[model samples]
Target chain A: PVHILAKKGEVAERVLVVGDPGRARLLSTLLQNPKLTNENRGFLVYTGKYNGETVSIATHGIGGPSIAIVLEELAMLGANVFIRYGTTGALVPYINLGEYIIVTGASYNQGGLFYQYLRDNACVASTPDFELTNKLVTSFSKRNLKYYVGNVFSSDAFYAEDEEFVKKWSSRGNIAVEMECATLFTLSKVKGWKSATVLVVSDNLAKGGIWITKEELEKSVMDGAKAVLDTLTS
Target chain B: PVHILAKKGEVAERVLVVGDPGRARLLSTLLQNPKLTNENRGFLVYTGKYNGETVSIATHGIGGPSIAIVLEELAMLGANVFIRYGTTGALVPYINLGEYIIVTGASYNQGGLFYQYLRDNACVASTPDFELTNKLVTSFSKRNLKYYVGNVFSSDAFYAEDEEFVKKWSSRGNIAVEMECATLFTLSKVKGWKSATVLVVSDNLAKTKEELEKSVMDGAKAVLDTLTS
Candidate 1:
């Protein structure tokens, strides 16, 4: 509990979150009026006003096993709108390198959160996300971003053990891969919150393509940050 | 316990197991050394030999929660080299319909084992089952039967609520999908046994393909049976 960190009234119900705490600081600057906040334990919070309402944004670091506390504590604090902005590897052959793909909903490949939400059998229900992901996808197209729309995958591994696993997703029409959306989407379901993901394709894991350059990754926080930013304003 | 269904001398060091009891029976009939070894707890057992060594065979029914017991119990019963003969979904597009895929190891996609062997953070290691699996894959290749080589994903979900999950595995490069090898492979690693899977691509979730007609499935089984026979 000393580890958890969010201040009372600091986190707004609607917030924009990224995986990197340093990038969350960038989001803090984008808000209309920003204030630093903290919880007694877990999470460093940055609260500010955005789009006429107060919004709080922060980072949950990475991995299901590592960030369980931040997800739970955030729910306890009554902030439910969850969205993950992160880098993804493009799996499908045609998806252009360095394009953006929003997640409609994610599959639960990550291990931790499902056991709580699943009751009937060893199998867990796929918590549903709004078609807003699809709607927002069309909206992104209007902005003239080269974006692909479809299923995006979530994994626990940032480094793949073998490329052999990639065929299963790409062959099944999955468009890309990332580490956090499945847990974030699942957590949002358990906590009764709205959740979605808008991932920018940074690398193509299956095609042997790395779309984003090293310099781009250094500055690409704005790629997803920009979409997530639009989510708040629109 | 009564569930560990084998008497002394009725099981072998090498075992060929199937997820369904009927498939186990089918495998036994095709066995080169089919002996009426043991039929305890409905887990029909047949002692056979592969590569000139004595082997045992049995049926282990579906899912990690139930099959975990079978794996541990088989270890206690002196069965060491375990193999699961089943069907899978193909991820590699080059392989035609009704092809066979050898699982060198499996990814921990669904569940059954792994918690006991390592912490929750660790992914299960795919068993290095190249000797026999390679032989089988080549066996089909030399004869012009369609086949593939690589990992089959073992998931507890016969059907997943989130098919997008497959996209990650496909993107990551898993060759096939099935329910049991993941548990068997992980358990074998922890229990100090050798294990592998030779899967028939009976279906593909990504391709929306279902198992071929029963007659076609039986024909594919005969070719695969050559590995055990």
Candidate 2:
């Protein structure tokens, strides 16, 4: 609550967290009677109602370390269940831009927050909650959305996803690459919270650097927002 | 083909290989009119028909060095595709005994064959053929068989998979621990051969055995179907 600065009970139990503050602001429109709960440290949090349930859409910023801090603070403020809706770069060629990837598991190299938290380099299972993950699948399927279910490599460095990096991670059974999910899932596991993630394909690294237009990304984000909210409120 | 001692045409382009000689001989029964192709150095090789296509079942013995030699020689003898159906110890608790793990990639330490092969410590992508791996997934799904798909750590030492070993590997995103997939995958990548692996969970490192025979038999047929498909 130090960073979030939200009083107890201001943040809802069910939360939709995103890495982008702008996206958080955009998604908050889907909620009824939304109120800006916290803007301290530029971490915008909006408390509101979705599907007749009190929920909060919060900004977590980028990377594992950043998300880890935000999630720990949010949990301290009474948020227990979380769904991270973000964007990712598809590692495989067949996944098109604006499609979704419901993460089943996450693969990450050892060290940093993981080592600091676990007190060792042991790789805890960085998998999403089974029921929550399945609900995401069902929600997307009901909406007739195009999505792939597979693992993702959560990288620490953004610019390091070069050609070699793409080949290495994709070959390791990851369909897409992103940041934050590893820390999100692992920290959730340790802290006894339910969490999952669905990512919009912002670009295809395997398809020669093709990037989705901002307008299209926004549309995709809005399209997927309801499904995530439905799953969160369910 | 130096070690295989089999004629080029005798070995099929599609092959299902294993680590146990007894298992290789037993699985060969699923094939039509099986023939003993080679038994040099006790590496049993059998050729037969599965799904009306020519296929071979061979023994790779134990460890990375053992499997590496068998694969290289088999590739020399006109075998271009391989599916290694073997046994592994589950590194995580949720994976039950007698289930299957369809290996996506392999993680291994540097040095030994890896150092000699790559000439340095660079970790290459030791993965399976995409199409072939997907076919295995489909085949197993059709049979309603229980299977988990993830990466495995290929340990060179059999006895090294102790308590600390389990935590270290499973934490690194590996689901199971096996003996040969790292070499199987890395060599296949370098030599341009299509290869994938399906491992039966013979033991569990986290929760930990005797019903392994039936499980191996059930998995062998599914592997054969994918190999010939």
Candidate 3:
């Protein structure tokens, strides 16, 4: 692939994609005999085995446009199934720091990549594969993980408004707010690939002054990694 | 007060209102010594005590114009606080039949009653009272009841399109679609009335439907608890 630099077959069909390169590096350790497949453009790619099945963990840096390119390249390199484990801010107050949110659907503003790709303003479902999503629920449930399954508002801008931002999106039924799930789910649908996302609550937009500790975030991330990998392999 | 034939004292300051008259009648049983205060134009109103606090359960027919008149008359008759316990069709597939949705805000087309009321086509922030909504969340949580909290599309027409209807509104971030909430919330903001809504999932537009009587009954009590509290 042009952007991913991974030779065909080096990237596995089953992949765990994340937005952070450091997270990709951290999660790759879970794979047995992990081999670095691609490190171009700082988008790290590692391929190895999890649960005796060949798998890959790759970095897909921030936002819809960025993730769009990475996912396109990864799919071209033989990856058909993807489970994105990313970070988000809790939009609702009930969800606490470091808990998980298994995204059901993504709500996004019309335009940019979405408009360019569809050539129209039609909101094309923007949901994950139902069976794959249900499997995520089962996998997380089996691990006794605390995760809420619901919709999220995927924002294009990171440095936006304050209380208005929290109230506006949360009021629209979104439990959490994040950056890239809209583009990922939309692209997966268009390209006939299976994709789903599970997010760790890094901070709460509703409760403004608090943030999840780095150690706590890492603990939550590592705790969720096995469940995600299990779902990916399954 | 003109529309609601009830006197000022008959209608309580705290009221639990619904869209269906049958539902209003069914829920009135939970109140002690419930009295029929009004039945004008089939807008049934019952007044009684719950947790020893005086409360009323009233019916607010269908759509924006209907609920607007009922809320206005109720507020005029000393009912300053209202919690509308209604039914809605789920727009998304994951939310099942017989579940509850605690409405956070309402999304609607900028026209009709909204335009007439605000005298413009501006999209007013149609949201519930923050404290009352939180009380609803807490009350439902305490009872260990399954409920989703989210926004709803307040549609003016009941006999609208099918799959396209679901896709368009749900993609706009609405969890469920119903009648009257946009009016209920917008009017509440304009007239300074404390209003909120909790809806039972009667059907799912994305999938299908089933019986919802048990779900309605269970949710009514939780709504009453929050209303009286």
Candidate 4:
């Protein structure tokens, strides 16, 4: 109602969320007759059909504040199930670009949106739905895709990367760093919604930038989209 | 080092910092012959004598990120002890506006600058230095100023208040809410700096508008006395 200018029944129950508007639009091509549902505040939401089932691809923007707002409004419009498809930076040197990280848990700094939502600084387990996450692992494996299952550090300030950023998060049991998974998982848990996240490694914080070309990255995104949609409809 | 441009020896061993640059300037008037030491990034830092002891009054800006940057750089410039003298919003109804809240511990979220600094998601106890906090209690009592001592929720998002925000934080043992105390205490613990915080209650979220100037100046004197003691 506030950020997203979408009506009721325009958004489907099964939703694939992303952090970028372009990514949401690009992935919507996988669905049949993808219709733009909302574009206010640059949150591009698309309602369409996947495997003859109704689904919506919505943009959540970046960070906790932006994503939290998008999710709250989208839920109000009737969308419930969410699977976040986004990019991430591998925290370990062993992980390569174009691979996948099926997020199991997310560790975040306490306060801000979470404190407002949960009402305390206690670290509530920001984990994905068990069965839904397992489905993602199975679906990706069926496509012979290389994926790692672990937790990620959800950062607030993207440019706040000090010299010790990689070592710190990796040592804390997080394999990657992204901006929104902690918020997504925790908010969904509190709101009684099912949610999960699968991130494509676009770069490596440990080893440096990936040697990924535009075409190769786009191909991986499309392939991951298909896998996510399949699992959501299943 | 990055945000604060103060060079070595320009800062003092003890500091009384506030969140706003204007407040720092106003508080510096209490010190004798206060000299403006640094004004870069709107963090006005003044070095002067308080009760014949060298002390500095500095500005830290709002929120954890801004304060974290300022404190790190202030430490790099030879400041060791810090007493955050700022304003706060009371979460409990008993704590009326214009009183004082000597912060014991700060409750904060587990990410952002905290994660980058602490290197983990451990909600490491963000309490002020015990001895300094006790000294704050003594100073306030001597001045006969109305004050309370307890924990405060150091919120990152200032305007992200929901309808139940006050009850949520207060029920979790937080007496009030501010922006930077959590980062101040936690980073102080990690960096081995002696730190404490005392806040003047400016507004009450759960419950009055009290004159802020009288409370701020009185609280300022108490903090200065403690710093010099």
- Residue pairs clashing, model 4: A108-B110, A109-B109, A109-B110, A109-B111, A110-B109, A110-B110, A110-B111, A111-B109, B1-B73
lDDT (tens digit, per residue) of candidate 4 on B1-229: 6346777898999999887666788888999999999866456899999888999999875556556667877888898899998888999999888999989898876656666666667768899999999999999999999988899998755545578788889999999998778878988998899999999888898883237788788899999999999
lDDT by residue (tens digit), candidate 1, B1-229: 3345577666776677765555566556555667856544345677765555666667654445335556666767787777677767777566656767767777764321243235454665667455666655655666665556677666543423554665867777687877667667666676677676777776565663345444234533443444454
Tell me the TM-score of candidate 2's A chain: 0.97
Q: List the candidates' TM-scores in order.
A: 0.49, 0.51, 0.51, 0.56
lDDT rank order: 4, 2, 3, 1
TM-score of chain B of each: 0.79, 0.96, 0.96, 0.96
Candidate 1 deviant stretches above 4 angstroms: A1-3, A39-42, A110-112, A120-122, A125-128, A218-220, B1-229
> What does candidate 4's lDDT look like per residue over A108-132, in tens digits?
8775677667767888999999999
- For candidate 2, what is the interface RMSD? 22.6
The complex in candidate 4 yields a DockQ of: 0.11
Candidate 2 segments whose C-alpha is farther than 4 A from its true place: A161-163, B1-229
Question: Which candidate number would show the highest DockQ if scored against the true structure?
Answer: 4
- lDDT on C-alpha atoms for all candidate structures: 0.60, 0.83, 0.82, 0.84
Candidate 3 lDDT over A32-141, as tens digits, reads 99999997655789999998999999987655655777788898889999999998889888888888999999998765456546656787888998999999999999
In candidate 2, list every pair of residues with a backbone clash. A123-B171
iRMS of candidate 3, one decimal? 23.0
